[PDB]
Write a protein that binds this ligand. Structure first.
Ligand code: CL
Ligand code: CL
Ligand code: CL
Ligand code: CL
Ligand code: MG
Ligand code: MG
Lengths: 296, 13, 247, 296, 247, 5
């Protein structure tokens, strides 16, 4: 009745057997015209699909959605080549390694590179940074903005920030993230979560509390995938090691997993995790005051 | 009569 | 209610409609008795470097092509749990089979499953879609069948409900394949290198194929748990045009 | 009172102490005529035995029941010699081994040989096939019917078929099997269950759920023995190995257990399980497009 | 209610009625003090190749024959849990003892037990039958005593109720043997090679016999748990005419 | 009824 379906026409389907919303969509057009006209059947089948959302779209319609997929440059051409252009949208990219490696440098570099117009007509956009480590430093972005020759205050105005103190708070923040993306449609292009799981290890530090930890972690990660795909944003998350933490839950949620390690002297190496030992699955990059860049 | 499948030989319209 | 029995004659009439969907490789088809069989679940597992995704994408095109035994071609439903379905991949395969890109893409229905519960709810919509366009759809692909079950039930105590939910989905999947005469193709992961799912997945699948890398760029398909004999193995190649035969 | 026992005569036994159906049958003829005449005592003792069914019959009456026991040829004379004629009625015969062995060939061969008149005046009869593996193929029976020179459609019309998807469904099917045997009395001669236990392993795949698995499995097998003995049918079941599965429950229920293994080239060997290593406990057979047969 | 005591004189009058049923072998009888004793449970166990079933079938005939100490013969009740009772086997044994086939078969009452609960319910009918034809029945055979208990309680947690139900049946069995003056003969399985049932069956049985294969076709019977001495052992033979003596 | 072939 909200859409405009008649009061006397909704009670017609109750007599034959239709009593639930799932029974309306599952009843075929061939069997719906035996209670009826196909003009009223197309109005009952359309309104049911609005409320129930089966999620079925053709591969052509999915291809039109994937044509909007972009990549956000890491600041290093070699690293970008490895990723197929950079941090991909409609996907979660996870980067893990030691503390001395450039997980925080990559997080801060992306805060600036995501605002810059790039390859494939990428126009740049705003960023949402969720900080669980108390590591976000806006002063760090000023040095990176200097490297890209962009205004400091403008870079800082396009980054939204929030500290998460608990796993529950981290999940509540994702509700505000979705609402913010829904407000300024197509404005935001990157969601950074540094780090994705430290709060989950903290809140569920017992062997008996691991079942609820896994459930809450999987609920957040499935929501994160939905946000990345529904709003066409790149999701970049950092992770700790013990092998990366999170087991199969984080491995499944992430579409691209990058292992960061120290190389010769001040150089760093990025590799696709669990991939075979071959040169095409590895890339060399440098860390400077201007963020992630290429080797000298 | 019934609706038959038409393979993807012909370009859609 | 009287669910009853049907005679072997009535069952034979139902089995006369059984078809096979070519994999794109004649050697692989010989191994399967024609290809991916309808009224049955075929499971393919191995490493990520092997052609599970190539076979999934190739079938999206070969299932639309008229084939052996009067197979007329039909539409496909692809349920993606891995975020690996790439329509651009189907364009290169459609070029190999000399078929229109937009027409191939219009005959494939797609859905992302984010949870095991969502994956099971999608099977309700699949059954309803098959019931609408009767005899139109010929293939249901689930890539992958179990990754979401490992994710949602990652505890040792939650294994009992995981097994129950997994068995409920697989028995429904067999019923869909047999009631609607469709081939069900599912991909699976491994954990020795053995496929995940235990006896539940082993029972549900009528044909289980182990995929492994062969010499250089070649691949080998074998019937899982079968004896070590040449007739239980087949060599195939992976190209931009999908699963094919070796040079 | 259903049989015809008087209303005033049923209340006579309530005064002395008789208040239950078990107390009527257990009270002797010597003590029943102290409340009475032996003409009315024989009417009270007969009606109690109809409702309570103690199951006591003399060995002469049991011998008359066993005189009806038949054997269904396997298609191989050597295999039949091993079984004492073939698949025996009023008994469960279990066959297990690897997938490459002829468990399915024996199942399909029996679908045809059970319809053929055989030794000891066996007249042939209809079959009920319960399929848990999705392996029953009527096209396979046509090649076997060709070997025995019998009509394809007639063979297929005499086999009743059902797919079992769950262990609960498998048990519910046995209720319909008993009712079908009760309808066409003496018409059906064979019940095939391929396989007997795969659904039980599937439905109870936990270590804690093993207690209910064993209970449900034992309930089905005791019902199966009762069906085979009450309706004089041969019950043939196939099983998997890990040693055969099922433990003592399946070992007890089966009267004859056959281990199938591959022999020289395309030949196969059948052996009575757990029997001593002697030639009389083994038999060689062949598998062809026409089913189970003898070696060349 | 006053269940009371009875003097040893009154008990001696009851024990004066105790009889033995010949096994068919004089050597085996010597070992048992005359044969299968009444007002007692005798248990025989061993491998399946040994003569547990031959002894069960032989007793079906020898219990009907007049014997030593004025034993007049009587009817038998056979409870079968193994589906091994074969009346045709009794005809060959009746031929050996020169007795009519139909008359032997008419004096044996038979029942199949499918569950442990059913086996226990059958003992209620056995007691009532003994109470009807007083002094007519002389032997109760249970082949086998415990296989159904292992089947119905196949879990480690269900062992407590298994032991309780098993002890309840065995204490009732002792009461039936002693109240109705009948010999109770039961067969048992083994799992070293030790009989199943633990202390419950060991306690209930007054005489326990271990059966094993001897030289060629000969068999050996021994009192279980007794010291290794010749007086605790006996040699016997198995023929188409049942349990007999060696050539 | 059973029709023996
Ligand atoms: Cl860093
Ligand atoms: Cl793969
Ligand atoms: Cl076979
Ligand atoms: Cl024995
Ligand atoms: Mg966290
Ligand atoms: Mg089963």
């Amino acid at each position: 009745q909200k859409h405009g379906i008649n009061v006397a026409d909704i009670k017609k389907l109750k007599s034959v057997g239709i009593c639930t919303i799932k029974g309306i969509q599952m009843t075929t057009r061939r069997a719906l015209c035996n209670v009826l006209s196909e003009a009223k059947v197309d109005k009952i089948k359309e309104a049911a699909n609005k409320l129930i959302e089966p999620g079925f779209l053709t591969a052509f319609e999915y291809s039109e959605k994937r044509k909007m997929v972009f990549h956000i440059t890491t600041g290093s051409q070699e690293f970008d080549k490895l990723l197929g252009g950079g941090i991909e949208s409609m996907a979660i990219t996870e980067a893990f390694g030691e503390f001395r490696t450039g997980k925080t440098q990559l997080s801060h570099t992306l805060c600036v590179t995501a605002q810059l117009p790039g390859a494939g007509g990428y126009p740049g956009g705003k960023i949402i940074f969720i900080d669980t480590e108390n590591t976000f430093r806006p002063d760090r972005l000023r040095d990176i903005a200097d490297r890209f020759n962009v205004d400091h205050d403008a870079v800082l105005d396009n980054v939204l920030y929030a500290r998460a103190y608990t796993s529950e708070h981290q999940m509540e923040l994702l509700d505000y993230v979705a609402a913010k993306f829904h407000e300024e449609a197509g404005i935001f292009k990157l969601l950074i979560i540094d780090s994705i799981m430290a709060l989950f290890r903290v809140d569920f530090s017992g062997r008996g509390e691991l079942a609820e930890r896994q459930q809450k972690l999987a609920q957040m990660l499935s929501r994160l995938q939905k946000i990345s795909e529904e709003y066409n944003v790149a999701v970049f998350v950092t992770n700790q090691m013990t092998k990366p933490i999170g087991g199969h839950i984080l491995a499944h949620a992430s579409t691209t997993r990058i292992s960061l390690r120290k190389g010769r002297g001040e150089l760093r190496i990025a590799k696709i995790y669990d991939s075979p030992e071959m040169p095409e699955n590895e890339a060399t990059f440098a860390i400077t005051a201007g963020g992630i860049g290429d080797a000298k | 009569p019934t609706k038959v499948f038409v393979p993807p030989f012909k370009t859609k319209s």
